[PDB]
């Protein structure tokens, strides 16, 4: 096994390794005990959490550092994501309207902030996601 503890205290753990460009098990633990699970294949680490038909995918190292993807297998009211590297922000949309931003802070926490009804501008304040259950709710 191989365990990496980041400066900010968050960790990445690889297990059941085969050649160390590929590992069958990979666990990332961010602040507030938000854990995502996945694997390492072809030197890229993919970690994820599922909620219903939605999958939040977090990919690490790909000549681009970190990429966050959203995948939704539902037909109607499908969520899609747009990742902004320079701001570490995942914008989630339901059909043609933006609905919220998820910001992954350098300190390892995650905030959520909603868009207005038109899906064009942010409103209110950003609030910290306190655990996995709250992250999953933001995917509903």
Swiss-Prot record:
Changing residue 20 to T: In strain: CA8. It is found in: Cell outer membrane. It comes from the Bacteria. This is Outer surface protein B. The chain holds residues 157 to 296 of 296 of the full protein.
